[PDB]
Write a structure and sequence with these properties.
- One of its GO terms (molecular function) is heme binding.
- Keywords: Heme, Iron, Metal-binding, Monooxygenase, Oxidoreductase.
- Pfam families: p450.
- Belongs to the cytochrome P450 family.
- The protein is globular and about 60 Å long.
- By secondary structure, the protein is α+β, with helices and mostly antiparallel strands.
- Strand 2 and strand 3 form a beta hairpin.
- It has helices at 12-16, 19-28, 45-52, 90-99, 102-126, 132-148, 158-168, 174-181, 184-193, 204-210, 222-232, 235-250, 252-260, 265-276, 307-310, 345-362, and strands at residues 4-5, 32-34, 39-42, 58-59, 128-130, 281-286, 290-292, 295-297, 302-306, 363-368, 373-375, 382-385, 387-392.
- It has one domain (1-393).
- The N and C termini lie far apart (58 Å).
- The structure holds protoporphyrin IX containing FE (HEM), 4-(thiophen-2-yl)benzoic acid and chloride ion.
- Protoporphyrin IX containing FE binds at residues 60, 64, 81-82, 93, 96, 100, 228-229, 232-233, 236-237, 240, 273, 278-279, 282, 334-336, 340, 342-344, 347-348.
């Protein structure tokens, strides 16, 4: 009933160009079995969306990586939000929602926007730059650690820690094993910064600790919730902004439309999130036998969702392989869907919007002018190096 495929979605070949294999996975059926890892897979929009929106049946508390927490020990203490199901998920989620809330974005927008304009002005003085190290990495590093309230010392641990976290959702391949081998100094730094005395007043970390007297979380839960923002809050945005710049570099007609109406900046970023999907895949575990898209899956089985594939599924999207900054993007799954849908999406969209606004107002052309190099991670998609020449408007 269910087709068995040998495709390895965690292989370097797949990362280098996932799109043909994703079509093969979608077209094989609504539910496939991946023999390489003994997991079920769903690559169509319909089933990805259905799985995400049934957290009772497709739970997160057994881990959102390949590893089943009922069978193996997690590599670090489980996240109180990502790796929790309702009702345990609900109150920590509400705290992070209020910490990263629509109202909070007002307190940071002016500074985030000025830093984006400043970075684009700096890059234009150099002309030829690496849009990864010099922009996609440099911009979030210039705003997010400060908004968290982190001290300056030790910030070089943040991107390695995040890469470790996202590699650790994969199978026990070399990318994952090597990340864990190297992890001790990054875990040590990150855990220490999560303690209340190490988080500057007014930042996101201090605000999480301030919620420990309302009855929503206790003091001993706050450090792990700070850990969540230090895990998911930087490397995702690096790959999102890198994706947007890569899209504008490859589709100059869309850069021209963005220049002509900079208020398209926010949707141009959302479309980049759909088109490249910085978070490509992750898992749920079944809590019962379940029928999904006409197939029967037993209890206790890992189900791999292909978010990037769902975002390119022609059953859902017109011209899915085109980057279109005026596309109606509502419904894409690049930030997830349902109860776990990205709690930091307003921070991500703010960074992306203000960066693309700066480019729209200040840059006339973005031309790739060197070898493009991909960065390999078990669940994040993005580039290692993107040499571009920026021409001023
Ligand atoms: C372009 C940038 C980003 C992308 C593509 C992205 C993607 C996602 C996705 C797909 C999920 C759902 C995971 C699941 O259902 O298991 C998620 C959850 C989450 N994200 Fe984001 N994210 C981004 C930025 C951020 C930022 C900036 C923050 C914090 C400042 C953040 C914090 C979180 C947290 C804490 C969760 C867990 C929420 C929950 O389990 O209820 N993310 N993100
Ligand atoms: O530590 C945390 O709570 C944490 C939360 C979310 C993530 C993401 C996984 C996949 C997309 S976002 C990773 C870590
Ligand atoms: Cl840790």
């Amino acid at each position: 009933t269910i087709p068995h495929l040998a495709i390895d979605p965690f292989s370097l070949d797949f990362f280098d160009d996932p799109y043909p294999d994703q079509q093969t996975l979608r077209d094989a059926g609504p539910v496939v079995y991946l023999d390489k890892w003994n997991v079920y897979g769903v690559a169509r929009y319909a089933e990805v969306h259905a799985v995400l929106n049934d957290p009772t049946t497709f739970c997160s508390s057994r881990g959102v990586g390949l590893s089943d927490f009922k069978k193996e020990k997690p590599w670090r203490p489980p996240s109180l939000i990502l790796e929790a199901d309702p009702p345990a998920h609900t109150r920590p989620r509400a705290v992070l929602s209020k910490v990263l809330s629509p109202a909070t974005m007002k307190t940071i927008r002016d500074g985030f926007a000025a830093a984006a304009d400043a970075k684009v002005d700096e890059l234009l003085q150099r002309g030829c730059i690496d849009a990864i190290a010099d922009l996609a990495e440099a911009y979030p590093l210039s705003v997010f650690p400060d908004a968290m309230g982190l001290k300056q010392e030790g910030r070089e641990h943040l991107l390695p820690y995040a890469g470790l976290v996202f590699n650790a959702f994969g199978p026990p391949n070399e990318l994952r094993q090597t990340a864990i081998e190297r992890s001790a100094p990054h875990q040590a730094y990150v855990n220490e910064q999560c303690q209340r005395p190490n988080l500057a007043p007014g930042g996101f970390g201090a605000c999480i600790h301030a919620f420990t007297d309302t009855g929503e979380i206790t003091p001993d839960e706050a450090p792990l919730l700070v850990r969540s923002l230090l895990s998911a809050g930087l490397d995702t945005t690096v790959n999102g902004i890198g994706a947007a710049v890569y899209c504008l570099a490859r589709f100059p007609g869309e850069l021209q439309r963005l220049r002509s109406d900079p208020t398209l900046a926010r949707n141009a970023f959302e479309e980049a999130v759909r088109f490249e999907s910085p978070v490509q895949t992750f898992f749920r575990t079944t809590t019962r036998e379940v029928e999904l898209g006409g197939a029967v899956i037993g209890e206790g089985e890992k189900v791999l969702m292909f978010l990037g594939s769902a975002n390119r599924d022609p059953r859902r999207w017109s011209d899915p392989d085109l980057y279109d900054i005026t596309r109606k993007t509502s419904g894409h799954v690049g930030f997830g869907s349902g109860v776990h849908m990205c709690v930091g999406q307003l921070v991500a969209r703010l960074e992306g919007e203000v960066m693309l606004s700066a480019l729209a107002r200040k840059v006339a052309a973005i031309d790739i002018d060197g070898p493009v190099k991909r960065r390999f991670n078990n669940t994040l998609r993005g580039l290692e190096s993107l040499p571009v020449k920026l021409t001023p408007a």
